[PDB]
Amino acid sequence: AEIYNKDGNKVDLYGKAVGLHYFSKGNGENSYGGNGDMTYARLGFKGETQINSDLTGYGQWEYNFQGNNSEGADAQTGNKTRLAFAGLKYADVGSFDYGRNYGVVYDALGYTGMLPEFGGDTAYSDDFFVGRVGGVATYRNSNFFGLVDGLNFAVQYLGKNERDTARRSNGDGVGGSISYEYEGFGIVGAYGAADRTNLQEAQPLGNGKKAEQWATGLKYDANNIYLAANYGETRNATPITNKFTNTSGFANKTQDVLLVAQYQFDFGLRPSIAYTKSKAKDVEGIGDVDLVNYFEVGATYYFNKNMSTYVDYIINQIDSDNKLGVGSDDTVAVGIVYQF
Amino acid sequence: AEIYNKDGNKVDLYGKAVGLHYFSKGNGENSYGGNGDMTYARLGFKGETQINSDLTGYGQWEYNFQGNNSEGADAQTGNKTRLAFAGLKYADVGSFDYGRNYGVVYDALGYTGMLPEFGGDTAYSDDFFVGRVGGVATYRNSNFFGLVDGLNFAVQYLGKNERDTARRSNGDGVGGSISYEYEGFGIVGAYGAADRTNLQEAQPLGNGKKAEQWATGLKYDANNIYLAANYGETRNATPITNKFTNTSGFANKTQDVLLVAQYQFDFGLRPSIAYTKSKAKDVEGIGDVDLVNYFEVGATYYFNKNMSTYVDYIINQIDSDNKLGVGSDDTVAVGIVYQF
Amino acid sequence: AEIYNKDGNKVDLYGKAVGLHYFSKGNGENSYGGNGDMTYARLGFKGETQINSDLTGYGQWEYNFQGNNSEGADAQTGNKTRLAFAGLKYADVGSFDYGRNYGVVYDALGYTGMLPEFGGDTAYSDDFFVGRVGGVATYRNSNFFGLVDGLNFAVQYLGKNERDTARRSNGDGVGGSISYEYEGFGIVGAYGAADRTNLQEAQPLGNGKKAEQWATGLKYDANNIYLAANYGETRNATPITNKFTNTSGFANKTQDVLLVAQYQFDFGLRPSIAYTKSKAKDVEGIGDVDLVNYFEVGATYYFNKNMSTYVDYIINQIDSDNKLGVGSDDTVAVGIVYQF
């Protein structure tokens, strides 16, 4: 909600309270999304100030407050800053920003990250260029310096992040993306490669000294219709865990497919149909293993722009004999969102 | 403070900074409220959007930021989300919301939770239906579908919450409350019962497979006068700790009484007089033991609606030979509140 | 940003997103400021309500959200409440507030805490009266009851804070400051002494039962020019660590000097030149050792009041044979700030 706007500076304070609950059988240990209360809230700000006609400064922060913890010792479980960055946009020269933000390969995966509650399985956090990461400097150009309507690109520099955990770490790397949008149609190509840290290399699963990730996407976005598809692959970048051995590391190789089809009725109802499948290849020990594999059917109903509710239903196709221990049960999420 | 209100959506961003200090003798280990700096702040939002004349969507989040921690490792001590839920209210049909919110038995205990700094001792957090809990779906009806002015009820479904701690856990249960308000007078009755988790049962104190809590309340609220009284009981629901043995669990049984008398002078001064006593029965090993027992005398002075200061004084009636180790010293809280 | 102002109550919600990165060689273990992503954000509120013509109530809270943590287990690293207090100001009688706030000796050190990214090295947190501490009650008087323009003083009472750590702890103490400002010129004198806790005394380094800190400051602030200087000393108050022995405690004695010279060009550029040196005397075992010692050259460029960027460069004068293990390498900070 734009709570402030004076002297060329406008501040949008935004947030939401999401009552949420997952239904899966058993202790949801073997299901797709788990089970039980998953309530949470978000609070963030996006500011933008016009330094002059061609120059704009801007910043953004967003935090995640779990609403399913007790007020006891576990009270902070799941809380975190999702985004934190500042930047400048100059005329048709492009924008530049630095901070915790989205990796460039997500310029592609974004296409199918449209499910009511699930989806976007391959867009992991602190996992190089596919989701939100810290220490990324991003340059973006729109309409090719204003010379080509619809042609955009981006290059991104990822600074080394040596964390206590191999999962949340990364070495230096570069990434880029090129996309093109013509009247409802959009196509993207994105790619990044980075150094792996000592600790990532000291891991049991996955083998290499460089991580890679690319994804391409195609979409048709117009006339109440949204159809999108993604295909990408990765080398030693996707994190996996053998639940049996309690071993961990990264998939040597994966091939990822994501399809989404949705329609927005005029009265508020937006049905969703989706398909996801990410399979790992050459896992040291297992061979080829599915990591994610399911059909999604769900629907969101918008009361207006501040209120909505939805049911997301995962029809898990993973099978009980999955070598890594990946869960095979179904999950149903029901939620009620208020937002501003 | 209502910082936003356009297109039927109004956002109230609220909060407070409370400079607070407790005075108790010794290391306040044996006193009622402890001793020393207890400064803290609150930040929350309450939004409400009119989807149409009969339908309203709404959400709320509130957080607690301790102001008495260092900026060192202990910096997060005491921080937590207090409330987080979204919901809908439809015409005279009632409201429904889901998230971290107040258990229904507090519809009763609320009556006497009016002290300047203390009071409301029996309304514990993450303790089934008496205080704030996670994963509660609540239906509330006002004026009996609009057919009976002043007659309200509520039913609430509590979802299992298996936490790492027996204190912060709960099984599934249902609760309800009926209250009636006629011209300054109000009466309430509230009740809930729930399953106890394995871990709650594995505890040294308390014995059963079901937790119960009911409370009734009576109040006279008009003419600058506020007089209220509560009486309730519980089975295996109230958490207790033997300080000697360092044993823990729940009271098999308790009987709780709370009385409050206050007056609001026209110039800002609101004196308070209260009495509280909660006694546990059949504690495995001790027999009957008082858990809370005191007189309260205090006063709040309102400079206006954003500024106030108060002194709350607990005249502890617990005695030094209390079998559980419950403290017997007095405590005096002084505080200065700014809020919006 | 003043997001609210009605009925004599105005709320200023403020914050910033700072994309930040440090450049130091090696693993920045031996450099002055470290190395890598240091992105972060701030969110705070300052409220003020006019109770009547002579009386004002007010409160403030400010929090620090690190933007360089993953969304994993380390997500909360560095987060904390910086300030949290409420208070009243009455006519020319003075103001009083209580909560987590700035120690009075900082009324002096503030003079030179003006560097783009570094500086203010002696103004440690939870370190008695020099930086932000919890449980301080502060009385401030301006213009000597309105009888002497430019003459101000303050007295401050610090309540004992027994934390789990000797570094973040303190006993009771009192502090005061007197300053005088005449047309661009300002002079200050500040002083405080406090009890040290058992745990502080149980430490390997430093010896005494009372901590002291005083600093004097001189400044010339006018005509786009800012020149300031500080000199202060401390007894058993400054925290130090022998990196070799991994020993810790407080410096028996230190002598601190800080000089700053800056100029604000009309077009937005504010160059900075500074010098800092804090040396410990009588360290048990080492003798005299420098703790901080460097030249700073840097510059901030203001796009407007909401957007700026800067480069701060530390020319470390500490030498590689520093007895405590204090780092000797240089550090360069580059940052881009959006704020409101």
Neighbours of A209 (CB within 10 A): 12
Whole-angstrom CA distances from B289 to A255, B323, B325, C219, C308 are 65, 7, 10, 65, 63
Query: Cβ of B61 and A66 within 8 Å?
Result: no
Interface test mutation site (partner B, options C7, C11, C42, C69, max chain B beta carbons within 10 A): C11
Nearest-angstrom CA–CA distance, C55 and A339: 38
- Elucidation method: X-ray
Query: Cβ of A85 and C19 within 8 Å?
Result: yes
Residues 6+ away with beta carbon under 8 Å from C53: none
Nearest-angstrom CA–CA distance, A63 and B230: 40
For residue C42, give both structure tokens.
């701030």
**Which residue among B3, B73, B340 places its CB closest to the CB of C9?**
B340
- d(CA A310, nearest CA chain C) in Å: 26
How many CA within 13 A on the CB side of residue A4? 26
Q: Which residues of C12-40 are buried (b: 16+ CB within 10 A; e: fewer)?
A: bbbbbbbbbbbbbeeebebbbbbbbbbbb
Query: Cβ of C135 and B43 within 8 Å?
Result: no
- d(CA C218, nearest CA chain A) in Å: 35
What was the resolution (in A) of this experimentally determined structure? 3.5
**Nearest-CA neighbor of C156 among C221, C85, C90, C218?**
C85
Nearest-angstrom CA–CA distance, B16 and C6: 17
For residue B311, give both structure tokens.
């002194």
DSSP letter at C28 equals: S
For residue C104, give both structure tokens.
């009075």
Cβ-based contacts of B51 with chain A (< 8 Å): 303-304, 307
Nearest-angstrom CA–CA distance, B239 and B170: 12
**Nearest-CA neighbor of C239 among C274, C199, C273, C272?**
C199
Nearest-angstrom CA–CA distance, A21 and C332: 48
Residue B230 CB-density burial (10 A; 0-12 exposed, 13-18 middle, 19+ buried): buried
Give the start-end residues of each E strand in B29-172. Answer: 36-37, 40-50, 55-66, 80-90, 94-102, 132-141, 151-158
Nearest-angstrom CA–CA distance, C248 and C205: 6
DSSP letter at C245 equals: T
Greatest pairwise CA separation for chain A in angstroms: 62
Is the separation of the CB atoms in A240 and A291 below 8 Å?
yes
Nearest-angstrom CA–CA distance, A33 and A331: 6
Nearest-angstrom CA–CA distance, B199 and B101: 23
3-state secondary structure of B116: coil
Residue C199 is inside which H or E element, if any? helix C198-201
- Where do the domains of chain B lie? 1-340
CB pairs < 8 Å spanning A and C? 154
Residue A244 CB-density burial (10 A; 0-12 exposed, 13-18 middle, 19+ buried): exposed
Query: Cβ of B17 and C159 within 8 Å?
Result: no
CATH topology for the A1-340 domain: Porin (2.40.160)
Whole-angstrom CA distances from C130 to A125, B38, B66, C27 are 39, 21, 21, 30
3-state secondary structure of A148: coil
| Nearest-by-CA chain A residue for B59 | A338
Cβ-based contacts of B11 with chain A (< 8 Å): 1, 3, 340
**Which residue among C8, C79, C100 places its CB closest to the CB of B39?**
C100
Nearest-angstrom CA–CA distance, A167 and A247: 12
Query: Cβ of A125 and C41 within 8 Å?
Result: no
Interface test mutation site (partner A, options B11, B58, B97, max chain A beta carbons within 10 A): B11
Terminal alpha carbon distance of chain A: 5
Is the separation of the CB atoms in A50 and A26 below 8 Å?
no
Residues 6+ away with beta carbon under 8 Å from A66: A39, A40, A76, A77, A78, A79, B81
The secondary structure of chain A in percent helix, strand, coil, rounded to multiples of 5, reads 5, 60, 35
DSSP conformation letters of C285-306: TTEEEEEEEEEEEEEEEESSSS
Nearest-angstrom CA–CA distance, B328 and B324: 11
Number of H helices, E strands in chain B: 3, 20
Nearest-angstrom CA–CA distance, C189 and C217: 7
Nearest-angstrom CA–CA distance, C221 and C225: 6
Residues of chain C with a CB closer than 8 angstroms to some CB in chain A: 1-3, 13, 15-21, 36-37, 39-41, 43, 65-76, 303-307, 336-340
3-state secondary structure of A9: strand
